[PDB]
């Protein structure tokens, strides 16, 4: 995640292998309930799209509901390609790219330019955009029960 330090300095950690552990439990006991939605949004504060990923691919025990994110999250992805359709370069030399649908999910981004988006100013809030598609993804799972 990315944290704020004292001198108001973006700082970049890797998860925490305690953040993860919690996961796995709280979706041991809650897995199709709705309080797994608020517990997601507790354990990813700052969460970059690498980090939601190796979230996601922590609790990677259930095809059939992992499948469904999954595809919530492909929809979501077309979607921003759909409303943001990319440009074949940025404005000038030195400016980021504006990111992809996939570069939002964290599947064709780098770390460092998630850090770049997130810690640009104001945020380029790719880490918070990816949460909205996983949380639309776990809502449809929860009816799904
Ligand atoms: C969102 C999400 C929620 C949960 C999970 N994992 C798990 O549920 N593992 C445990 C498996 S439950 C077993 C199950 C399969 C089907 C049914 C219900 N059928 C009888 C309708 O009951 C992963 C993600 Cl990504
Ligand atoms: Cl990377
Ligand atoms: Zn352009
Ligand atoms: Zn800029």
């Known amino acids: 995640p990315i944290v704020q330090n004292l001198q108001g300095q973006m700082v970049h950690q890797a998860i925490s292998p305690r953040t993860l552990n919690a996961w796995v439990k709280v979706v041991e006991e809650k897995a199709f309930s709705p309080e797994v939605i608020p517990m997601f949004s507790a354990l990813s504060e700052g969460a970059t799209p690498q ?3 190796t979230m996601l691919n922590t609790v990677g025990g259930h095809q059939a509901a992992m499948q469904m994110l999954k595809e919530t999250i492909n929809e979501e992805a077309a979607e921003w390609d759909r409303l943001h359709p ?3 370069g940025p404005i000038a030399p030195g400016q980021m790219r504006e990111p992809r649908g996939s570069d939002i999910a964290g599947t064709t981004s780098t770390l460092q330019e998630q850090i770049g988006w997130m810690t640009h100013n104001p945020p380029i809030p790719v ?3 990816y949460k909205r598609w996983i949380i639309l993804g776990l809502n449809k799972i929860v009816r799904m029960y």
Request: aromatic residues 0%; hydrophobic residues 45%.
């Open 86 to 88: 990319v440009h074949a």
């Open 127 to 129: 880490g918070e955009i």
């Open 51 to 53: 980090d939601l990923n």
